[PDB]
């Protein structure tokens, strides 16, 4: 049902005349639409936005103003939110293994909601923020996750209540259970299964006199790649919500979406800076590559949808980035029209785990994130409606 | 002669004073690396490929030693400019340039370029009319870690045509360059490339196009977790001997990156968490694959890790501090029992490491501390 944010060819042209490539263009209205869709289809799970996916300040402010909470991974992330006026009470420090700077930032900002998955974490947490609310993260199954989040993270389920009891012994507040099924999950069942497991744990805790009040179901909601998205997100979210109503009518339930919130709200605009026409497969060199926004190729095993403009015949083509490294090859055997130096191409669904792993390799600048609603092209869309 | 390596004592005293993670660079080791190259490869003047490590004190050291610089972008030119390096000292050796880079080259009077395609000629001639150009040719190497000859390099049969077209656009056809690949374990690749270049210089002479300069690129290797079987002295002497034989009347240059600093930097990082439940213990470190260990991903690399202290070792896993499952750095690594707060040391970490670090998950970039500016250095000089 929902439309992904996509710039038109005309918009690409006018934007790139004004702004030097490469740049990202983010639609706040599409971030908002994504937040509201999750509120509509998954009403039971309050949102802690996993800003690790995309920390663009205007996005964070938008989300804060919509009532979102935030999942923070580091001191840096807390500091960003603090400078935007967000109180520590709206944060969960959900990195199960915290460092000294992070714990100090948490104390400074009155962040007192933590996750953990190991006994070695308890004394660090109890010392930095005594009496903090803690959710123990359990390791869960998922046969359809792009990124496994249950080997490096997550306690065995049979240690969960023992960990909560040890944290309680150290003066922390044993508040509940969390899990993350893994990133880019194409499984709804994984959420349903984790929910049943947590239900049994909550019941066993109650008997021990520990009363658990909060359940955090993590993120993993998927976004379309160069082959679309083979999941119906509304049905996924409704099925999760149904299982939460079924099992957890009286518990405060929460979610930590990262990828989903902005993935479909951001486009990359990049120019062809060189061609190589010799031989059978042409090459085009772009001004953005694998050490910038296309770093998700490497870290996130990802294939982004590339759009070329032009109505003539297409042939298999290679696209590379602007660095001096051989690894900087983005697409091979990609059906493309004949492009020339100065042509702009468009990459859609570029909002998540892209700019956050960009670098200044070879001294290139970080591509900036342009706010679409501040540009005359947005206004032109409003008037066209 | 030997790698820069902090002792355990030095690690402990540094880490009491500087929060982990941090890199420590030895300027004296960089200088020793530069001098070693001057000694064993005297015929090739150095354009330092600062893409490997652009730490400002290193660049300033190198500039003070008389090094030139290979720049890959506007940003790199800007860094050198702020350090008072003149554009005469730079080669803009990215074969495919962008608008900002060409504008910076113009502003700073950088007038030496490489290229490998006819589509690059007009860009260069517009930006810096009359610039000196070297045409980059594609060459073979079956012992390179990183292939620098598929994305880059013109076919040899196109080279002189490219120089002539450059001439037609008013650029100065100065000569030929090549890069055999990064982490080359072959000396032959260099000797064979020199031979190809020599045939082209012979042919260009017969056409009345007299070429004056040859740039042989980089690729000199650095040790990894398994060390290094290449004798660097012998590789450099072999190359130099071929330069003397085939290019006695040509100005020859080299563009080392990795070699210059790779052996001059160490990383210090703390254990921030343990996981003992397994048959195999895990240790979580405060630096990972989204920081200086990014070379695991982009550079196919394995770094030498040193753990300290005592007792029986068992196979252990080390992960980084991110929330990502991919942030696993070593598996089945024989390590002693470590605890939260213990420091570990990674050596030979100076090249293509901090340069591909990120602020993923909001972590700060690990800073580069200059060893020579630290009491630990003075203390080594007091000993001696
Ligand atoms: C604790 C936590 N919350 C939220 C997220 C966001 O995940 P996704 O982008 O798959 O929704 C992650 C992903 O790494 C995570 O580790
Ligand atoms: C143009 C150029 N010069 C020099 C180098 C340095 O290579 P190395 O670090 O292997 O010496 C590179 C590596 O990408 C390069 O592209
Ligand atoms: Na159990
Ligand atoms: Na039950
Ligand atoms: Na990267
Ligand atoms: Na990286």
Author numbering:
A (entry chain A): 0 to 384
B (entry chain B): 1 to 384
Task: Give the published text.
Lysine decarboxylase (LDC) is an important enzyme for maintenance of pH homeostasis and the biosynthesis of cadaverine. In addition, LDC plays a crucial role in the synthesis of cadaverine, an important industrial platform chemical. We also reported that, due to the flexible PLP binding site, the protein undergoes an open/closed conformational change at the PLP binding site depending on the PLP binding. Especially, two loops located in the vicinity of the PLP binding site, the PLP stabilization loop (PS-loop) and the regulatory loop (R-loop), undergoes a significant structural movement depending on the PLP binding.
